[PDB]
Amino acid sequence: ARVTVQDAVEKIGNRFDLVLVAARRARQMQVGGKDPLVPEENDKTTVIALREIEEGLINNQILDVRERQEQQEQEAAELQAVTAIAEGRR
Amino acid sequence: QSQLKLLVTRGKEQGYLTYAEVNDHLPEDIVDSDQIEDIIQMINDMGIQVMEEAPDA
Amino acid sequence: ETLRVDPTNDRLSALVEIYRMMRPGEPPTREAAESLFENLFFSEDRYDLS
Amino acid sequence: LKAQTKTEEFDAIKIALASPDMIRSWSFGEVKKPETINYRTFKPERDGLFCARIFGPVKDYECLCGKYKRLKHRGVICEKCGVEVTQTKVRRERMGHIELASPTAHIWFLKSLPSRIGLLLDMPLRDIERVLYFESYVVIEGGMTNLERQQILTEEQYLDALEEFGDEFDAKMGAEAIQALLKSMDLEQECEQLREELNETNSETKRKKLTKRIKLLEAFVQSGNKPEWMILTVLPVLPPDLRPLVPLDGGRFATSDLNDLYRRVINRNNRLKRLLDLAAPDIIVRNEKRMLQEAVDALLDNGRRGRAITGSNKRPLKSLADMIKGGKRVDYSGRSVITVGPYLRLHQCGLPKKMALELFKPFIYGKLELRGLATTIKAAKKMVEREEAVVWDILDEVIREHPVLLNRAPTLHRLGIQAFEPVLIEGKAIQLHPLVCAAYNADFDGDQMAVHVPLTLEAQLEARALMMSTNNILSPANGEPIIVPSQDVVLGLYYMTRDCVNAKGEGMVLTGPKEAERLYRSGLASLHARVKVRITEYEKDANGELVAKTSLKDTTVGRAILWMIVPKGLPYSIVNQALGKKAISKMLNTCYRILGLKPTVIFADQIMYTGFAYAARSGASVGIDDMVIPEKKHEIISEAEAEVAEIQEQFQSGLVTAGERYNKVIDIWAAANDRVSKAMMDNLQTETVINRDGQEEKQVSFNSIYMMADSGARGSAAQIRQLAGMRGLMAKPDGSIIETPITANFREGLNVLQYFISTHGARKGLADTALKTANSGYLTRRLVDVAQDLVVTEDDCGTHEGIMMTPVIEGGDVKEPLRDRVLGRVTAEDVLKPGTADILVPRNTLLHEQWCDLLEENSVDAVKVRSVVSCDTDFGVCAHCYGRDLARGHIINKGEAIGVIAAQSIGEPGTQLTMRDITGGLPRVADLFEARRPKEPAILAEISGIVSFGKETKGKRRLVITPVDGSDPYEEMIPKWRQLNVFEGERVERGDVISDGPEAPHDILRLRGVHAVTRYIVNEVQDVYRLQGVKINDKHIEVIVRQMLRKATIVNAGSSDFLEGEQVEYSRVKIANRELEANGKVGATYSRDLLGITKASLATESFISAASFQETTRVLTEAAVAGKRDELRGLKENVIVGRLIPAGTGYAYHQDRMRRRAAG
Ligand SMILES: [Mg+2]
Ligand SMILES: [Zn+2]
Ligand SMILES: [Zn+2]
């Protein structure tokens, strides 16, 4: 997708929304848990996110849901510390 | 009378805002740096009605 | 028509009006009103067509 | 339970007057001395303009004296010197104040066009407000006998009135007098009594001043500001760092003028305070107060009255206002001379090795320390500063898919800045793709372009998904391709057609690709014969896909090999069967519409490679024998001068009107010029003989020059006519034409005389260019300022109404049709069909479906279409109602930026407009947009009635027409001057012509209709683009006319107050919310009002946005008076504040925050 980037907008209209979600994913890759889905092949996170969007995976709703599960994974799994702190001030 | 009639009738609208015109058709001591801004302000921007605010001021 | 629109009537009022037009401020006198108009088109140190 | 008290996110900014206590709140101390820095130690004085205790410390964390040095005491003030030891940037943010003895008038609210302090108080400005506060004529402050409430008295009148009464009407003079006047003024009780008195039995002889002041008083009282704040008793002080005095090179300090201002005001203020303790002679003290007035007024804003001077400079001093009344340098940037780069792709650019090395410096650092190589960050610096081989390979990694965006000086439109993938090149020059070299209007005269590095992550994706060159295939202005092949490439593909007969020809047939082998191996030529070959075509229909079609067609060598470049689809061959001229772009266009982006992009690179390569093979040059003069030149010239000779002899013997024989003899030479021009072209066009089989035949000249002209590549008829034909009628400085045209031409010698004549043309050519180039941008600035706030929103509203689109027809008496003005347009509603059905309701007319509007014959030449002119949107634009025309093929993306793109496209071709019942040119465009009444305006019938004379010249007067019918009459005023067009007794319709002259857009909108006036502006502004031959879509004209018709005027009775001319934005939203709120009778009907670009842009919600272009001193003041607040939706105002733009990649952010600000 190093020359449009047009195939990606077909999967999600509004080229502006495309930039937001693609940057959102490219941000996840650059810093934090990387884990690309399409093979890298020496491509920057800039384009890697766009390759995914073209492929059909990783859209706006998809990331939001995986963030919901990510939150349920960080919270529900480590609630033993929060509940312990909850009894701190009665 | 003189200032009001001359200003209005002439400026319609003097095309390219001919500043160097009516300032000579004014009394009192000339060559001032005070009366200047009071003319550049009225002519444009708020046309028509501004030319009725000028005389009353 | 030019005379019909001329406020001044003599040499004093003329030189005085010119003195008030050129240097609007101080009260026009005799020496000042005269010497000024003379030092405009009638003085080598103040005027020259070359 | 928020109520946070820190510097968090803000949704709006407020502007208003500042109370004396409001100033104190900012005060981190009081300046009391005119002193700045020490004469010997160069140290901040105690309580001077540059105090350390009041403002901030000199050094970062060490105090003034030196009792405390390091970070040990960063929160504690020093013992010997109350110096808070934090940062030095504290010095940049700390306020402070000066407290004056006697009150002082704020120069802005005193003398800034309308007297704010005066009109609020109802009092003359430079007449009365001056003489009473300059200590000359005492003023009254309310009396219950003899005297009134604001009369002006003299010393003699004062004591007389004091003697008669006194001690019960006390009223001072000066600043503090006006203070008590503004303070004693009750905005409440006056707001009531003014409403009472100024509504009692008064026609239109008073209502002017009535409505004006009452609105002004209601605003100010509701503003929250107390009129006490108008004149200040406490003057705040600007932070020292914003007006420093810094040592330059070898002494010689450099200080701001504000220090002179603050130092003066301090001196005069302290002297005043001293005189208000010692002996106080009225003359001495009152003068010093006036002197304090001078200093303060000069410090706030010089302007204005003589201009304070001093400071050794004969030039005035830059006061506070002049520093904020009236280009953004940026890091990670560079520039260099541009160079052609043929080997590049459409998404690539040659970025110099050393250039890119310095530009990606922080990226190289990070990637070095990331991999290894450099042990630390400073090692990376030392490693790249010593460009150590390996670093270059790291560089090749960092610029990989990291787009860089290029920019040229004259940025007329969006395509001025386009992004590419950086390509390392061993050189110091920046190479560019020769296809987008036309979008920049860039040549290689030594022109130079700048480069920017998208640092932010989404900044790269923005450059890749929006600004990337591959996404800019079509022009935003017109749907046609912009990256279309130019001079070199086009001549190339023109050479790959051009069927020449025989000459190593013959119709030896084969199969496409094999023909390549035939050309390289000689034997056969290339431009023959014609020759037949097998073409495997591919087409699609209904269910798409692809359908093969092998056949045998008669093409040429060039067409066969060129066929390889053509993409999968397309009609094939026939696109090559033509030539290379304008269809060269046509081929690219259709490919884009039937294939898509990528197939068109690669197709562009391929046709570029092809054109260049085969153009080199062709070796077209320009010898001296290439521009062949006609043989009948001397003949035609002799015949033309023979004719004029007879005409001169006639003039000698009277006969013919000598007064205008000049005109007819010019017609002689003008005909003669056309004769030589026609002869030169007909000769240089055909010619040739060749020798096919049995010889004798004719084609078209292979005369290089002709080939360039017959294939774009900068070669027009006029220029060629000057080369071989003759330079025709030459202009004279007077403006008149010389009756002795340049008989000779450039192929021949040129006599000194006619060259000294032609130099006038060259001089005025370059000069007129220099003017219209700056005037073009001058127009664009106005277009942008007015239009750059609207963006397509709320997806796709309802509404069906819209201008009925019809082919622009001058064919009434000249025959000239143009019917491509409907495409990518959303249909109003099922626009009929000679029978039934067909066209849907909201179906956007596709490119292939506009071609379907020819299958319904020439009968259907009218379709109602939704436009930005209509659209029942509120503060934006319906997506459907707009269209689609972009570099993109689909409809405009929701939350684009229609405004700026519209203005750009309109003012981009401004470079090519010639300034002058037909004005014509850029000036005509301006007048049409400004909506200026003609020098001889026509007149229309407001109501349909019976025309009859209304008292023949009985005024005054000057004729009078009275169209009366049904009910009620009218009396129009005809000034004798100029005739008429309708006899007495005859009837007229609602808006009929009765002057047969130039029409005024004001009357058309006011009477004829909105569709009529907008149709007028678009069709009339286009007509000047028709002559200049510049293609520009009608959409953008409608876009500006949209908010050109932004505001209206209400005439009835509603929640809005009648005479107020308010915009349909608030109107429509408020009239919709009243029919179903309480009653429709609590609201009035409005009336659209035409106002020009400037007059429209003058009005806008944001006060910061206004403070951008219009007079900042004015807008900021009047916006200060009333409790105004920007909050905060516009583009321009949201740029200077330095935040996300409410459009495009933003928009979503603003929409979220906009709804977010609904809780409170
Ligand atoms: Mg150039
Ligand atoms: Zn200290
Ligand atoms: Zn709409």
Side-chain angles (χ1 to χ4, degrees):
Chain A
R2 60 202 66 95
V3 275
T4 79
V5 124
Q6 220 293 323
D7 304 85
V9 187
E10 285 298 342
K11 294 304 176 66
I12 35 177
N14 195 269
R15 292 188 289 191
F16 308 134
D17 278 279
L18 185 278
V19 173
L20 270 297
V21 65
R24 178 188 179 94
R25 177 59 177 178
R27 177 66 54 75
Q28 291 185 342
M29 292 183 188
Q30 188 183 356
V31 51
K34 297 183 177 181
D35 300 326
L37 306 180
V38 176
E40 297 186 0
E41 306 181 5
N42 291 11
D43 282 22
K44 294 289 181 59
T45 178
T46 293
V47 179
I48 297 295
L50 296 168
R51 295 178 63 180
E52 292 176 338
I53 298 170
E54 288 183 344
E55 195 67 38
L57 200 46
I58 306 299
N59 298 336
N60 203 324
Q61 174 182 347
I62 306 307
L63 294 175
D64 287 334
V65 168
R66 290 191 181 184
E67 180 179 351
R68 292 173 190 176
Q69 300 178 5
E70 185 65 16
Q71 184 67 8
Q72 265 63 284
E73 187 171 0
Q74 291 180 356
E75 225 179 6
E78 318 305 332
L79 82 178
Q80 308 182 29
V82 179
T83 59
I85 300 181
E87 293 186 355
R89 295 177 176 176
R90 301 184 180 183
Chain B
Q1 289 184 344
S2 58
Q3 296 170 316
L4 308 186
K5 296 177 181 179
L6 292 175
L7 276 168
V8 175
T9 59
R10 288 168 176 163
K12 296 177 66 286
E13 198 243 2
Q14 280 193 347
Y16 17 92
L17 299 182
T18 323
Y19 195 83
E21 280 286 330
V22 68
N23 45 240
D24 291 27
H25 298 284
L26 297 179
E28 300 177 347
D29 285 330
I30 205 63
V31 290
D32 62 81
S33 181
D34 171 40
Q35 183 183 273
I36 303 300
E37 78 196 52
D38 295 281
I39 300 183
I40 60 86
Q41 62 185 216
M42 297 299 184
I43 49 182
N44 211 264
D45 285 331
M46 304 296 296
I48 299 300
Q49 267 288 188
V50 65
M51 302 303 300
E52 296 183 357
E53 297 178 341
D56 298 334
Chain C
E1 298 302 294
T2 300
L3 282 173
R4 293 177 192 281
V5 298
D6 189 31
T8 63
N9 45 13
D10 65 332
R11 184 174 182 270
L12 174 55
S13 58
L15 297 171
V16 163
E17 179 66 24
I18 294 175
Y19 189 92
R20 190 173 62 81
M21 192 279 294
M22 291 294 299
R23 296 183 181 180
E26 70 283 349
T29 65
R30 185 75 172 185
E31 258 64 22
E34 290 179 357
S35 183
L36 173 138
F37 179 79
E38 293 294 342
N39 295 19
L40 283 177
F41 315 97
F42 313 94
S43 183
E44 184 176 356
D45 49 27
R46 292 282 298 275
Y47 186 86
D48 190 29
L49 298 180
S50 72
Chain D
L1 56 163
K2 223 305 179 295
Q4 58 87 10
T5 180
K6 260 60 235 60
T7 309
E8 307 304 279
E9 293 293 339
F10 55 93
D11 294 32
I13 83 170
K14 178 176 176 58
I15 177 181
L17 279 294
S19 313
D21 294 272
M22 174 80 279
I23 309 301
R24 260 72 152 273
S25 301
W26 306 331
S27 305
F28 285 88
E30 183 179 327
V31 171
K32 262 297 299 297
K33 302 181 69 64
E35 327 292 320
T36 62
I37 201 74
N38 197 327
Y39 85 101
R40 179 176 172 274
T41 66
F42 292 177
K43 178 227 302 79
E45 291 297 337
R46 177 64 213 274
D47 289 317
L49 289 312
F50 295 94
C51 167
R53 306 190 193 188
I54 296 180
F55 308 95
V58 176
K59 300 293 270 70
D60 277 88
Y61 276 88
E62 65 179 15
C63 75
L64 184 62
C65 59
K67 294 281 269 63
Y68 311 85
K69 293 297 180 61
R70 210 41 186 181
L71 314 182
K72 307 303 175 290
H73 314 79
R74 52 81 180 182
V76 180
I77 58 94
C78 165
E79 188 72 8
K80 298 179 64 178
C81 51
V83 178
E84 179 177 348
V85 260
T86 305
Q87 291 285 351
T88 189
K89 199 159 71 71
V90 160
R91 190 173 194 78
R92 190 182 192 83
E93 297 176 358
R94 289 283 200 277
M95 288 298 302
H97 72 307
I98 306 172
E99 195 132 13
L100 305 89
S102 293
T104 301
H106 191 289
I107 226 300
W108 280 5
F109 300 91
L110 200 187
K111 188 178 187 298
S112 72
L113 295 78
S115 181
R116 319 306 293 195
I117 193 174
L119 180 52
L120 170 60
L121 190 60
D122 186 34
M123 195 177 295
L125 178 53
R126 62 101 70 263
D127 302 277
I128 279 64
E129 276 291 353
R130 181 185 65 85
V131 299
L132 97 311
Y133 111 102
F134 268 169
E135 278 75 43
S136 188
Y137 291 147
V138 181
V139 78
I140 183 68
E141 308 169 359
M144 50 300 300
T145 177
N146 196 270
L147 286 71
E148 41 273 282
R149 203 264 178 179
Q150 291 186 181
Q151 206 214 346
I152 302 85
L153 292 80
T154 307
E155 61 273 2
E156 294 163 12
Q157 311 167 26
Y158 193 7
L159 65 82
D160 277 324
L162 211 305
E163 188 173 61
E164 294 292 284
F165 317 98
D167 201 33
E168 36 61 54
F169 81 110
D170 208 328
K172 304 86 64 58
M173 71 189 314
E176 66 251 23
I178 223 66
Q179 190 170 86
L181 250 170
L182 297 175
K183 178 163 52 183
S184 68
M185 159 167 284
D186 198 325
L187 288 307
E188 305 165 1
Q189 292 184 346
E190 283 203 24
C191 187
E192 293 181 352
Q193 289 189 343
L194 271 283
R195 286 177 181 179
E196 294 186 357
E197 297 174 346
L198 311 186
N199 284 317
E200 232 166 23
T201 175
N202 56 265
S203 64
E204 229 294 299
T205 59
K206 298 180 182 178
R207 289 174 188 178
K208 300 173 188 175
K209 294 184 179 180
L210 313 189
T211 188
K212 294 170 189 176
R213 198 204 169 189
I214 63 173
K215 289 175 182 172
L216 294 167
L217 291 182
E218 180 179 354
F220 186 83
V221 64
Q222 193 180 318
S223 66
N225 299 327
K226 196 69 181 294
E228 279 73 310
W229 322 147
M230 287 285 286
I231 62 164
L232 34 63
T233 176
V234 178
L235 163 60
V237 178
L238 187 72
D241 259 38
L242 282 56
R243 46 149 243 281
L245 72 179
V246 51
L248 203 68
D249 296 320
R252 293 239 62 183
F253 286 76
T255 177
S256 181
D257 300 31
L258 278 65
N259 295 314
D260 193 285
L261 278 300
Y262 274 105
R263 187 165 37 79
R264 163 158 50 263
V265 61
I266 282 291
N267 271 324
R268 298 190 181 187
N269 184 77
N270 285 334
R271 285 212 310 271
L272 196 284
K273 292 170 66 178
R274 183 165 53 178
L275 294 177
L276 293 185
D277 195 272
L278 309 181
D282 51 84
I283 292 182
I284 303 300
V285 61
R286 75 100 192 189
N287 167 77
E288 181 65 290
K289 289 189 187 191
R290 280 190 299 95
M291 292 170 57
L292 177 63
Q293 199 64 230
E294 262 276 307
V296 170
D297 294 341
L299 184 156
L300 300 178
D301 184 14
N302 259 77
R304 209 169 190 89
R305 290 191 160 183
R307 299 185 169 184
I309 184 68
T310 67
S312 303
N313 303 121
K314 289 186 176 181
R315 71 190 52 266
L317 287 45
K318 292 283 303 306
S319 59
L320 282 169
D322 289 334
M323 286 189 68
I324 57 176
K325 172 187 179 63
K328 267 295 182 178
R329 301 213 185 185
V330 285
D331 292 322
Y332 304 85
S333 304
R335 64 172 165 88
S336 176
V337 175
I338 62 177
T339 302
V340 60
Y343 75 96
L344 279 58
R345 274 199 166 190
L346 192 136
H347 74 287
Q348 297 178 335
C349 65
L351 183 62
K353 49 178 170 56
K354 189 172 175 293
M355 197 168 191
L357 194 284
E358 259 292 339
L359 287 170
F360 294 78
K361 189 78 75 68
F363 296 98
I364 300 168
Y365 291 167
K367 215 60 177 289
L368 279 174
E369 185 174 337
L370 189 154
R371 293 299 190 81
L373 300 77
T375 314
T376 185
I377 178 67
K378 249 181 68 176
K381 170 180 183 303
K382 188 176 182 297
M383 189 170 296
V384 307
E385 187 174 338
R386 301 182 63 175
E387 45 200 356
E388 186 181 355
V390 179
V391 58
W392 297 108
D393 295 327
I394 301 299
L395 179 59
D396 287 332
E397 179 185 10
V398 302
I399 89 299
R400 270 286 298 174
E401 298 179 326
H402 189 156
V404 163
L405 45 93
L406 273 60
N407 175 36
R408 196 173 182 269
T411 304
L412 281 308
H413 56 192
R414 186 177 74 175
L415 302 183
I417 298 89
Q418 300 187 53
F420 303 84
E421 279 198 333
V423 177
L424 278 297
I425 164 177
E426 291 267 327
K428 295 186 75 67
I430 164 175
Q431 293 188 332
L432 180 62
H433 192 232
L435 283 188
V436 299
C437 192
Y440 294 146
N441 191 19
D443 287 43
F444 301 99
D445 305 292
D447 301 83
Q448 44 188 335
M449 290 180 56
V451 294
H452 297 247
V453 177
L455 307 171
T456 301
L457 202 293
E458 32 270 14
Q460 295 172 112
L461 278 70
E462 277 183 351
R464 177 175 293 281
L466 292 69
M467 310 175 68
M468 183 65 71
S469 57
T470 58
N471 287 37
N472 295 323
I473 296 300
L474 309 177
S475 169
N478 54 88
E480 299 186 2
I482 190 64
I483 77 295
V484 51
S486 80
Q487 54 197 270
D488 235 40
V489 48
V490 169
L491 194 217
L493 288 183
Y494 173 81
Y495 193 82
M496 290 197 67
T497 317
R498 192 72 161 82
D499 39 30
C500 179
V501 182
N502 70 86
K504 299 295 107 66
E506 106 180 2
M508 50 189 294
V509 305
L510 228 182
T511 48
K514 292 289 274 76
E515 107 89 44
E517 177 181 354
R518 281 181 167 178
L519 180 55
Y520 294 112
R521 252 50 199 93
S522 183
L524 53 136
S526 58
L527 315 182
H528 61 270
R530 297 184 177 184
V531 51
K532 309 183 180 182
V533 283
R534 274 217 302 177
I535 297 87
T536 305
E537 294 180 52
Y538 284 85
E539 298 182 5
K540 63 177 182 179
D541 197 334
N543 205 265
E545 299 183 326
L546 292 174
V547 175
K549 180 179 299 185
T550 55
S551 65
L552 184 74
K553 292 193 172 182
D554 323 340
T555 75
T556 178
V557 160
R559 300 168 192 182
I561 178 58
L562 187 277
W563 192 94
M564 294 197 69
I565 284 72
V566 181
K568 298 298 179 294
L570 275 77
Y572 271 146
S573 246
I574 60 96
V575 293
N576 308 335
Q577 222 77 348
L579 63 163
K581 174 74 178 187
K582 301 169 192 181
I584 182 54
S585 181
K586 167 196 179 181
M587 174 177 60
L588 205 297
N589 185 22
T590 60
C591 174
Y592 180 79
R593 273 63 196 274
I594 66 190
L595 264 295
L597 264 294
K598 167 152 287 183
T600 304
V601 174
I602 187 64
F603 175 56
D605 286 293
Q606 294 294 326
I607 61 183
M608 190 191 77
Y609 298 160
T610 301
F612 289 156
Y614 286 83
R617 184 79 80 174
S618 63
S621 300
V622 284
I624 190 64
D625 297 275
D626 282 272
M627 34 193 65
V628 178
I629 54 92
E631 306 86 291
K632 315 302 291 293
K633 182 192 175 60
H634 294 277
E635 285 290 85
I636 293 294
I637 295 173
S638 293
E639 294 165 356
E641 75 187 351
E643 191 174 357
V644 70
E646 285 290 350
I647 299 311
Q648 288 176 357
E649 194 175 21
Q650 290 179 0
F651 142 80
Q652 173 61 78
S653 176
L655 271 58
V656 299
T657 170
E660 64 93 36
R661 80 89 181 266
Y662 164 81
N663 294 88
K664 53 97 77 295
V665 300
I666 281 182
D667 281 283
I668 296 174
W669 278 116
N673 188 14
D674 290 27
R675 299 263 271 189
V676 176
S677 183
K678 172 179 172 58
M680 182 204 70
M681 274 305 302
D682 292 331
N683 195 329
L684 191 133
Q685 174 189 344
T686 55
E687 257 299 330
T688 67
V689 285
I690 330 166
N691 252 14
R692 86 297 188 280
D693 297 336
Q695 79 189 64
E696 251 58 288
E697 198 172 31
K698 292 177 60 179
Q699 297 175 179
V700 164
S701 312
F702 273 81
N703 194 83
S704 304
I705 295 294
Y706 177 90
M707 302 184 63
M708 296 176 180
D710 202 344
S711 61
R714 47 181 50 173
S716 58
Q719 298 176 348
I720 303 307
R721 188 203 67 183
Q722 297 177 37
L723 287 175
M726 59 162 55
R727 306 199 68 180
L729 290 305
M730 274 301 173
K732 185 160 51 63
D734 301 85
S736 308
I737 304 178
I738 189 65
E739 60 172 11
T740 306
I742 295 180
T743 53
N745 54 85
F746 292 107
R747 168 64 181 280
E748 308 173 358
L750 277 300
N751 62 87
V752 56
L753 192 281
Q754 109 272 280
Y755 199 50
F756 184 83
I757 268 55
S758 70
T759 187
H760 165 66
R763 186 78 65 86
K764 74 179 181 61
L766 298 171
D768 286 21
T769 298
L771 285 177
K772 64 206 239 178
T773 48
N775 198 273
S776 171
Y778 211 138
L779 178 61
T780 299
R781 289 223 314 272
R782 293 184 289 183
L783 268 294
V784 177
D785 279 335
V786 74
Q788 74 155 127
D789 284 278
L790 64 80
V791 181
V792 48
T793 180
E794 68 162 313
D795 299 325
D796 311 84
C797 70
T799 254
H800 294 281
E801 72 285 346
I803 56 174
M804 183 70 70
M805 199 62 66
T806 171
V808 285
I809 27 75
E810 301 180 13
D813 293 270
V814 84
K815 182 100 297 77
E816 177 172 17
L818 299 88
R819 194 36 182 79
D820 49 21
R821 76 208 306 262
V822 175
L823 60 86
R825 286 284 197 165
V826 168
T827 302
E829 81 290 351
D830 37 84
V831 192
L832 303 180
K833 161 70 190 177
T836 179
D838 197 342
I839 173 60
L840 302 182
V841 177
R843 179 258 282 178
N844 57 328
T845 299
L846 280 176
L847 316 113
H848 299 173
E849 218 158 3
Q850 108 86 10
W851 293 343
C852 183
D853 284 275
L854 289 306
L855 281 64
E856 29 92 318
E857 311 302 336
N858 198 92
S859 177
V860 180
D861 295 339
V863 289
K864 199 169 186 178
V865 44
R866 288 151 75 173
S867 177
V868 296
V869 170
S870 61
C871 181
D872 196 52
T873 186
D874 300 279
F875 294 87
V877 165
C878 171
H880 278 357
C881 297
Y882 182 85
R884 50 142 272 179
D885 187 19
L886 295 175
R888 186 193 181 79
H890 315 271
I891 62 177
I892 27 71
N893 312 280
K894 58 99 177 303
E896 192 84 18
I898 303 308
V900 292
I901 145 268
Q904 285 169 179
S905 49
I906 299 304
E908 178 275 326
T911 311
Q912 47 184 322
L913 297 177
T914 60
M915 319 68 58
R916 61 114 290 269
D917 60 330
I918 22 67
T919 304
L922 182 58
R924 178 59 183 177
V925 177
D927 289 21
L928 287 172
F929 287 170
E930 295 286 9
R932 59 107 76 264
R933 60 274 181 171
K935 192 177 181 179
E936 46 184 355
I939 36 172
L940 307 176
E942 299 184 350
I943 296 194
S944 57
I946 307 178
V947 172
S948 57
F949 73 96
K951 300 154 282 168
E952 300 178 1
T953 69
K954 291 194 176 179
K956 302 180 178 183
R957 296 194 182 184
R958 310 180 164 187
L959 279 72
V960 172
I961 299 178
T962 59
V964 189
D965 184 27
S967 295
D968 301 274
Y970 271 89
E971 296 191 50
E972 247 79 352
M973 289 301 306
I974 289 71
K976 275 189 175 183
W977 207 5
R978 283 66 190 269
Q979 291 69 5
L980 226 66
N981 213 339
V982 172
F983 307 98
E984 301 169 7
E986 296 188 359
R987 294 183 177 181
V988 296
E989 305 178 0
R990 300 177 179 182
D992 277 19
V993 176
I994 191 49
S995 181
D996 47 275
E999 272 183 342
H1002 292 355
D1003 294 327
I1004 300 174
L1005 180 274
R1006 181 186 60 84
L1007 183 56
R1008 195 78 58 78
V1010 51
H1011 288 14
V1013 66
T1014 58
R1015 173 176 174 80
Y1016 165 72
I1017 297 175
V1018 62
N1019 287 330
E1020 193 66 19
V1021 72
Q1022 283 290 358
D1023 277 16
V1024 308
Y1025 284 155
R1026 301 301 182 185
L1027 202 157
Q1028 294 295 278
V1030 283
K1031 48 276 181 58
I1032 169 65
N1033 198 286
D1034 301 32
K1035 263 186 296 296
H1036 305 138
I1037 298 298
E1038 297 165 2
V1039 166
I1040 75 158
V1041 80
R1042 152 62 187 280
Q1043 45 72 34
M1044 182 170 160
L1045 292 169
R1046 188 190 300 100
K1047 96 168 183 72
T1049 50
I1050 45 173
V1051 189
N1052 178 248
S1055 301
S1056 190
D1057 43 25
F1058 193 69
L1059 277 179
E1060 194 177 32
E1062 192 68 1
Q1063 56 191 351
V1064 297
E1065 297 169 9
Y1066 285 92
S1067 305
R1068 289 184 167 189
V1069 301
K1070 195 173 295 299
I1071 67 181
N1073 193 260
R1074 76 174 168 97
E1075 304 282 18
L1076 306 85
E1077 181 180 24
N1079 42 9
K1081 297 289 123 294
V1082 79
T1085 51
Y1086 66 87
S1087 174
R1088 283 291 162 110
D1089 211 324
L1090 204 309
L1091 61 165
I1093 273 48
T1094 59
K1095 302 299 295 181
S1097 59
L1098 191 69
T1100 178
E1101 296 183 359
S1102 170
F1103 66 83
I1104 313 175
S1105 178
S1108 309
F1109 47 90
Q1110 40 176 322
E1111 301 189 13
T1112 68
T1113 308
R1114 303 193 312 95
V1115 56
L1116 197 55
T1117 301
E1118 68 90 35
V1121 170
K1124 213 166 191 177
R1125 49 133 56 180
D1126 183 20
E1127 54 154 358
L1128 205 178
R1129 316 162 184 172
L1131 299 198
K1132 189 188 301 296
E1133 65 266 46
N1134 217 297
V1135 167
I1136 49 194
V1137 69
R1139 299 208 299 184
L1140 284 305
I1141 298 83
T1145 308
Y1147 185 84
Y1149 172 85
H1150 257 76
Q1151 225 62 30
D1152 290 25
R1153 274 256 289 92
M1154 208 63 63
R1155 300 188 320 276
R1156 210 63 171 270
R1157 211 263 301 280

